[PDB]
Design a protein around this ligand. Structure first.
Ligand code: ZN
Ligand code: ZN
Lengths: 82, 9
């Protein structure tokens, strides 16, 4: 989305240890400016998590964005591998 | 995987 509007999908508490907060966030990855980078987790009907909260370094994040494989967040990847 | 805000700066 553009300008000032529905950005709530970005400012959720993506996981129990979510460190991203609308009131304090600043860019970290080279690809960020005013919004946190996110990754789609294929668990169940799927959900989005903050890349930063998954403790992913930039190169890993970039590889994920370029690949066609499914991603499972730290909370669900173990269930997916079982 | 699908991602948001990952376009090269
Ligand atoms: Zn988060
Ligand atoms: Zn997940």
């Amino acid at each position: 989305g553009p300008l000032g509007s529905p950005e709530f999908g970005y400012w959720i508490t993506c996981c129990p240890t979510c460190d991203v907060d609308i009131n304090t966030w600043v860019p970290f990855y080279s690809t960020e400016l005013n919004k946190p980078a996110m990754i789609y987790c294929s668990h169940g009907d799927g959900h989005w998590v903050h890349a930063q909260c998954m403790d992913l370094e930039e190169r890993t994040l970039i590889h994920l964005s370029e690949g066609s494989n499914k991603y499972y967040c730290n909370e669900h990847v173990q269930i997916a591998r079982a | 995987a699908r991602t948001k805000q990952t376009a090269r700066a």
